[PDB]
Amino acid sequence: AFDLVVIGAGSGGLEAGWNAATLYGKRVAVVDVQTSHGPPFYAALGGTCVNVGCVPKKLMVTGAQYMDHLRESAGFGWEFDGSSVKANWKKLIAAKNEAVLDINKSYEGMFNDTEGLDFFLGWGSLESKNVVVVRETADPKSAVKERLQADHILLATGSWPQMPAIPGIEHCISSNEAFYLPEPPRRVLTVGGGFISVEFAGIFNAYKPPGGKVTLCYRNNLILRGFDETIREEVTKQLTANGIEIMTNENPAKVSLNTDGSKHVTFESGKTLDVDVVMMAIGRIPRTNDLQLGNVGVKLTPKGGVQVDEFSRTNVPNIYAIGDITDRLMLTPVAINEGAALVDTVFGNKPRKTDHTRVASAVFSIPPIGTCGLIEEVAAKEFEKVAVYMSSFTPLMHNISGSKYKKFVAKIVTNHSDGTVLGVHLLGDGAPEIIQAVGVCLRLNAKISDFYNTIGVHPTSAEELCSMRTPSYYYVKGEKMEKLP
Amino acid sequence: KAFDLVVIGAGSGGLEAGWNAATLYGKRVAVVDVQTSHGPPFYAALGGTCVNVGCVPKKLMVTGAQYMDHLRESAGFGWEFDGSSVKANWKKLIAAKNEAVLDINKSYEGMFNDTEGLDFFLGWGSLESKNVVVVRETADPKSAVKERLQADHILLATGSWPQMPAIPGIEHCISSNEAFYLPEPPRRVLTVGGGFISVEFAGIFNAYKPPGGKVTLCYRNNLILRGFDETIREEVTKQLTANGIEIMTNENPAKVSLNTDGSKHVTFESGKTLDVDVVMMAIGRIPRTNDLQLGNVGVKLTPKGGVQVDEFSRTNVPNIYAIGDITDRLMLTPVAINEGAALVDTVFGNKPRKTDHTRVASAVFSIPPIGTCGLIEEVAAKEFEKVAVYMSSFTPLMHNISGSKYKKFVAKIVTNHSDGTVLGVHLLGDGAPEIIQAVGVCLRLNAKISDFYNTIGVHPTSAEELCSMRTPSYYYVKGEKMEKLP
Ligand SMILES: Cc1cc2nc3c(=O)[nH]c(=O)nc-3n(C[C@H](O)[C@H](O)[C@H](O)COP(=O)(O)OP(=O)(O)OC[C@H]3O[C@@H](n4cnc5c(N)ncnc54)[C@H](O)[C@@H]3O)c2cc1C
Ligand SMILES: Cc1cc2nc3c(=O)[nH]c(=O)nc-3n(C[C@H](O)[C@H](O)[C@H](O)COP(=O)(O)OP(=O)(O)OC[C@H]3O[C@@H](n4cnc5c(N)ncnc54)[C@H](O)[C@@H]3O)c2cc1C
Ligand SMILES: C(#Cc1nc(-c2ccc3c(ccn3C[C@@H]3CCCN3)c2)sc1C1(N2CCCC2)CCCCC1)CNCC1CCC1
Ligand SMILES: C(#Cc1nc(-c2ccc3c(ccn3C[C@@H]3CCCN3)c2)sc1C1(N2CCCC2)CCCCC1)CNCC1CCC1
């Protein structure tokens, strides 16, 4: 029998398994449906992040940024045969595939060289409070390969893309298939306002063949809901400046195939659009339907997530749940932190719970976003006096590069009673790297005075965070006003 | 012409002090400088050395140089074009760089024109008496007087100047001032000096050199970038060598002569020789005290050459102050800004503030760049009983695909191991200058190592390495380097 069985060899499942086995000598089993990236199941050993998430996403955005580099280099005297330029999508994917497969292999080797840490290929599910069955397929009636006896069971199966119930949805893809398109689409429509749709819009915009067009549609008025609103409006503009068509207050109603294999999209508003690819990126839902949670009584939240307490425990004793399946912060480092904290509490004498506040995240759009803490309108409903410090500027190089539209935005939100910084929001190149150390600042409850009394590093964009001393406006009892009464 | 404040030197520190005194405390301010825009004959001008012949132009040209790597590295991500058609136009880079600096010059002139009690005077300032700044047509005390500015307070803020060694043929060499206006990119160039100016210009010249070119950097001691973390000093040496730059350590030029075609014949103290088209001296910058007539009123200099000041920027003469490079401490623009702002708060706002010169974050825009804040381990070991070093070094994944496998990232955290306080952070790699900024805020808060690795990381970034080091790589006990503790 195993001290612990983990269903899902992803960001959270692997941290919890490795720690419990190497730090505490416990006997661990880990189940995943594949050993290497790709169809049919896309995610595999490593998790969504390694196989069809952060890692290949970052590589493909890097590749897409070269479209700007090539164009901007002329402002600094560089020339080359523009007509010979080709963005070879098939080589990008091949390089991504080999980079991901290398990670797949190293995790494979990890299991083969760690005693007390074993991997089982198959589909895991709950047969009882103490048994995880491994079948050949997600079908509960498929052949059994294993029945793992477990003193503790960890649910860490991640999440799965959400798809709307419209006629012709089968002709639409999600981010999973976008990583494996054999050719770069000339015309693509990304559906959604979230970070996945924006990031892939930039990727497709760079590698599209001549005559191409990337359209992004969103059912409400402003994309990237949940991010700072100044950044939301500015990123919309800068995407438009780089050729992406942003189509707000629109939503697909049906999709049919044209005689050439392209898709005819009809929107609820009657508008129509023909594209080669339609990528649904309207949300990620917890991946629970294959686990047979009813066999055991694991309760879910109203919106489909596995309900846990601040220590990641389900209502069933000795059954825990971490990561995206809990439907809180769908971030890789969070799932790692929840995995490590769980094992410390269960297999050690050090109870530890992960802080889900003041977590720094990023969006690798072109231009990128970096954020940590509360946006202002949320803070306005939680604090009596709120100050907003805002600063927009054109970085030095973009006065020469030919990309004047690349304005950098820095915003700081404080509790104005004592100047405690509640949120920092950045837009512009470098923002993802700038914001990491800002997260450390907010654990230490840094005040605005701690930022503008720190001496800047010149010339940097991050310098701006230490150059703001006077609020641009306030919120008192939830009311926006420039000057205080 | 009775001013509250007269500033000699319209630079980084001088401009901050004059603007604060005028706009925040309604004081009448005069500011003196020798030009209103960048370039010859005097190079620095309205805006200072940073705007005109320092950080700002330096940065734009390094950015242009980085496109040599971008264009090569793009192939790994599927980008295809005619490699043989790639050319770098140096005159376009200079021309574009001049436009951007002049826009800053123009902007500053409009600030003076539109702000009450903030007047600009063109000429050369100097001390006539304790309360009189005289402005002449040239730096020569015999040149004609333009104004005598009556001043209740005087601020010395003239910056620094490139130091040129007294070797035969020095007249055939240049400094960084002239490098910003070279009509052509040198095919062969020798940057003399191991500091950040020489390293950064090596990167620039390496990217824009015509075919068959070579950049050589020489330094009289064994390892370049003294003062920085030793690991990073060695890695940048490797990564400069990896990008084609010959480093020539333990060598120092002894003379320069002219060849028939106009090139320079360099003879080193070791008897070695080298032929280059340009010799750029960047061995140091010295405080610019020679034209101020400090002896007239008796402003004292330190044993080192800078204007002696107490922690509130006050000189030995009452109502005369000095900030910035002329005080010859940390020759950084943001420090001169901070010193100038603290000076005005103290003098005019009865708000006594002084600049903290410790834990200052700074950068080197080498390719790849450096970001640093706080102490290096050698210095912390002489100052703390138990010291620990957390170290992580690796080639990022993107640079495996890009083909630049030599671009090893380096993160190092130095701590006082007795309580875990972070004493210094040192970075090498893309984004290091941007990462290190908020690290200065962390060190201002006396952050501890645990504050870093208990912060949730941002993935995937280089910065998140700073939050995933929790076990020291080695220690310094009583100044002795060891891997494990006793
Ligand atoms: C396109 C995209 C980009 C992203 N970019 C980022 C980013 O930049 N930064 C970031 O922090 N996060 C990002 N995320 C989110 C991140 O990938 C997840 O938050 C992260 O994987 C944490 O999830 P987890 O560890 O809980 O589960 P995962 O890491 O998803 O692992 C779940 C694993 O369980 C397996 N599994 C599922 N069901 C079963 C079953 N029945 N039996 C056996 N195995 C099963 C799956 O194959 C999978 O490998 C991105 C996600 C996507 C889709
Ligand atoms: C090539 C180079 C690159 C650099 N890069 C960086 C960097 O990346 N980051 C950074 O932080 N720092 C950098 N520095 C340093 C930075 O430029 C200086 O530390 C900063 O400009 C000093 O400001 P200051 O106020 O002391 O005087 P300065 O800014 O030097 O201004 C002094 C001014 O006084 C004027 N002046 C001189 N004598 C007289 C007189 N008799 N009468 C009237 N006016 C006079 C001059 O014309 C000059 O404009 C760099 C310096 C150089 C040379
Ligand atoms: C990694 C890794 C890693 N590689 C290991 C490993 C690697 C190789 C192994 C073994 C055991 C045997 N081998 C084979 C030997 C040793 C290396 C090659 N040959 C173990 S163990 C390991 C770690 N765990 C794996 C699952 C998550 C925790 C993560 C890194 C710290 C050490 C543990 C990359 N981390 C980046 C992520 C993205 C968010 C953080
Ligand atoms: C700056 C600035 C700045 N511009 C000002 C300014 C600029 C223009 C002004 C006035 C007052 C009137 N004008 C003219 C306006 C312009 C449009 C209409 N008329 C004031 S005031 C000002 C500040 N300092 C004053 C002395 C120089 C720095 C810094 C920014 C906050 C305000 C003061 C940074 N420039 C970027 C480069 C990168 C290295 C430096």
TrEMBL record, chain A:
Record-annotated disulphide pairs: 49-54, 49-54
Broad class of enzyme this protein falls into: oxidoreductase
EC number: 1.8.1.12
Binding site for Mg(2+): 111, 114, 117-118
Name of the protein: Trypanothione reductase
Lineage: Eukaryota, Discoba, Euglenozoa, Kinetoplastea, Metakinetoplastina
A GO CC term attached to the entry: kinetoplast
Localization per Swiss-Prot or TrEMBL: Cytoplasm
Keywords: Cytoplasm, Disulfide bond, FAD, Flavoprotein, Metal-binding, NAD, NADP, Nucleotide-binding, Oxidoreductase, Redox-active center
Residues annotated as domain Pyridine nucleotide-disulphide oxidoreductase dimerisation: 359-465
Sequence similarity: Belongs to the class-I pyridine nucleotide-disulfide oxidoreductase family.
Chain residues that bind FAD: 11-12, 32, 44, 48-49, 57-58, 124, 157-159, 324, 332, 458
Principal location: cytoplasm
Molecular functions (GO terms): flavin adenine dinucleotide binding; metal ion binding; thioredoxin-disulfide reductase (NADPH) activity; trypanothione-disulfide reductase (NADPH) activity
Binding site for NAD(+): 192-199, 283
GO biological process: cell redox homeostasis
Active site: 458
Record text on cofactor binding: Binds 1 FAD per subunit.
